[model samples]
Target: PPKKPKKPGDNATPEKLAAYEKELAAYEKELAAY
Candidate 1:
């Protein structure tokens, strides 16, 4: 059987989550420049 999809924020700490958000913002900015 296929495994279930994991939740996006599962087991995330505040520091880790903040880092992810910052990375995502940078990615979005790059995409917008295209």
Candidate 2:
């Protein structure tokens, strides 16, 4: 059976959300580094 997925805005603190975005941007930058 599949588990339920959480929503993006659920249980996420402001700092955590900000950190997620920052890390995602960093990942994108790294991918483009080539």
Candidate 3:
């Protein structure tokens, strides 16, 4: 899935934070190809 930008009210729990970071990393990798 694509990484979602941090929203003002976004509350990511510790458990989900890791996944969010991973998603953000993957998104960055995808962008690097361009």
Candidate 4:
């Protein structure tokens, strides 16, 4: 199954924040590319 991306929580760890940032950036890039 495909992995579903979701926002990190308010008390997110540094690593979680980094992952979320990358995920969000990729999504934004896709939207703009369309």
lDDT by residue for model 2 (1-34), tens: 2222332486788877777777767666776774
Per-residue alpha-carbon lDDT of candidate 1 for residues 1-34, written as tens digits (9 for 90 to 100): 2223332486878777777777767766776775
What's the TM for model 2? Answer: 0.52
- Residue-pair clashes per candidate: 0, 0, 0, 0
TM-scores, all candidates, are 0.58, 0.52, 0.55, 0.63
Tell me each candidate's RMSD, in Å, in order. Answer: 8.4, 8.0, 3.9, 3.7
- The per-model lDDT (C-alpha) reads 0.62, 0.62, 0.63, 0.77
Model 1 earns a TM-score of: 0.58
Model 1, residue 4: what's the lDDT? 30
Top candidate on lDDT is 4
Instruction: Provide the lDDT at 19 for model 2.
Output: 73
- Provide the lDDT at 34 for model 4: 62
For the record, the alpha-carbon RMSD of candidate 3 to the native fold, in angstroms, is 3.9
Q: Lowest summed-lDDT stretch of 10 residues in model 2?
A: 1-10
lDDT by residue for model 3 (1-34), tens = 4445452335657767777677768778877764
lDDT for residue 14 in candidate 3, whole number 0-100: 72
CA shift of 6, model 3, Å: 6.2
Q: Enumerate residue pairs that collide in model 3.
A: none
lDDT of 3 at 2: 45
